[PDB]
Amino acid sequence: VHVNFYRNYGKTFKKPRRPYEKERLDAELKLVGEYGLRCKRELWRVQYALSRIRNAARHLLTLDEKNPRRIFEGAALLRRMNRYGLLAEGQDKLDYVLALTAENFLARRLQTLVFKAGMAKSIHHARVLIRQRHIRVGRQIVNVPSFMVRVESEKHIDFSLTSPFGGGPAGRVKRKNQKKA
Template sequence: MPRIKTVHSKVTKSPRRPFEKERLDQELKLIGEFGLKNKREVWRVKYTLAKVRKAARELLTLEEKDPKRLFEGNALLRRLVRIGVLPEDRMKLDYILGLRVEDFLERRLQTQVFKLGLAKSIHHARVLIRHSHIR
């Protein structure tokens, strides 16, 4: 019986240059600071940020009063505010271009557990979440 192929959307994008020293150092710093498991988690966040910034750049090319820019721009801004990446006082498309990878990584449950002091270290926070002590 033949298998049915399922279509999955892309979640990550591997870097073009695999051995770029600055990028490797930056990724290693992010992994240590936020307690990530591997570099694929960094790439996933970078890919998400790139998609959001690309959408904002496309909307910024349209005119101010364009209905598409107003509708899709407000939807994008509300989504970013809802997930906690963008503060409510910065609800403009220009501020989306200033977002960093760290803004997305700050919103992870593991980081929040550590920042609230519920775990002794960032790695301890990951263990608590994986063992279902914190949901």
């Protein structure tokens, strides 16, 4: 026996049943361009996560409002949706969880929030800035653009202290240029 065999893993996305439908291709490309995604799989995994959350919410809506599992798991689901900024305060019911779209999840990415915070000129500039290790959430630098930012962590998105845009020293391009000068 190898102990490593017991580590779990799973798939994060599915491919569409119809590969070449014009309407779906246009909608996916519109979302990808709006949020600077690297491929369709990044949107497909968000759709996969939304599908699992929606299935959970629907299954508790098909149970009584006194069923102790619906009180408990619906409270947990609402806490998770409020924690990541996916739901407002007035939207405090399991019904509103069913109304969530992949747009709501894509709007909470570190790339989208870095772009909307003014730190980057474009969504693609935000993507490169995050992948260049210039962005920290709290004290932790995050080089992963699909990072889902909590509302309590939104106000702590900032330039890295080791980055030239965050008080750090100049990068190798600038330093080499001044050394040439």
